[PDB]
Amino acid sequence: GSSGSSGPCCRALYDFEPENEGELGFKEGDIITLTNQIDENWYEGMLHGHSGFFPINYVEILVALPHSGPSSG
């Protein structure tokens, strides 16, 4: 199959509900697109037409973002 174009994406290992405004609640299985990073343990993406931040201790990064520079090494 020809998808066309694909970028960095992550998979949720469990379910997480938003506690504070903005929070981006995910669901075990739902792939959360990756756009940018605000925190050192949080990420940013688009899900259900909503732009919010989500924890990394719940999802796994399959494709390392294109971002370049200093990083855990």
From Swiss-Prot:
Residues annotated with Phosphotyrosine modification: Y14
Organs and tissues of expression: Brain, mostly in frontal cortex. Expressed at high level in fetal cerebellum.
Location of the protein in the cell: Cytoplasm; Membrane; Early endosome; Presynapse
Domain SH3, residue spans: 8-64
Domain of life: Eukaryota
Function description: Implicated in synaptic vesicle endocytosis. May recruit other proteins to membranes with high curvature. Required for BDNF-dependent dendrite outgrowth. Cooperates with SH3GL2 to mediate BDNF-NTRK2 early endocytic trafficking and signaling from early endosomes.
Note, other: HeLa cells expressing the N-BAR domain of SH3GL2 show tubulation of the plasma membrane. The N-BAR domain binds liposomes and induces formation of tubules from liposomes. The N-terminal amphipathic helix is required for liposome binding. The second amphipathic helix enhances liposome tubulation.
Family as reported in the entry's similarity comment: Belongs to the endophilin family.
Subunit structure: Monomer; in cytoplasm. Homodimer; when associated with membranes. Interacts with OPHN1. Interacts with SYNJ1. Interacts with DNM1. Interacts with MAP4K3; the interaction appears to regulate MAP4K3-mediated JNK activation. Interacts with PDCD6IP. Interacts with ATXN2. Interacts with ADAM9 and ADAM15 cytoplasmic tails. Interacts with BIN2. Interacts with TMEM108. Interacts with ADGRB2.
Description of its domains: An N-terminal amphipathic helix, the BAR domain and a second amphipathic helix inserted into helix 1 of the BAR domain (N-BAR domain) induce membrane curvature and bind curved membranes. The BAR domain dimer forms a rigid crescent shaped bundle of helices with the pair of second amphipathic helices protruding towards the membrane-binding surface.
Protein name: Endophilin-A1
Upper classification of the organism: Eukaryota, Metazoa, Chordata, Craniata, Vertebrata
Residues of the full protein shown: 293 to 352 of 352
